[PDB]
Design a protein around this ligand. Structure first.
Ligand SMILES: [Ca+2]
Ligand SMILES: [Ca+2]
Length: 88
């Protein structure tokens, strides 16, 4: 009748979790692949999309650290620091 969506598998094959454990602010994958958008994994990376300009990757520990790391300011989305777009 209703088919269920498949779960997420860590890019390193170390675990399979439902997609509600993706970006849930707890590190479930040894490679950090379940938390690309948060500061939860010690070896993760956050992608600065920097729309219109060169994209950059930063350490996950720099997501919501209150410091402006991406020129588009997208790394600071719930920290209290409001970053201005400085890509130009
Ligand atoms: Ca997680
Ligand atoms: Ca930051």
């Amino acid at each position: 009748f209703y088919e269920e969506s498949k779960p997420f598998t860590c890019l390193d094959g170390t675990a399979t979790i439902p997609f509600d454990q993706v970006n849930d602010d707890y590190c479930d994958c040894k490679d950090g692949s379940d938390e690309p958008g948060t500061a939860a994994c010690p070896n993760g990376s956050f992608h600065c999309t920097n729309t219109g300009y060169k994209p950059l990757y930063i350490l996950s520990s720099r997501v919501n650290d209150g410091v402006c790391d991406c020129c588009d300011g997208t790394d600071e989305y719930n920290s209290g620091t409001v970053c201005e777009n400085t890509c130009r």
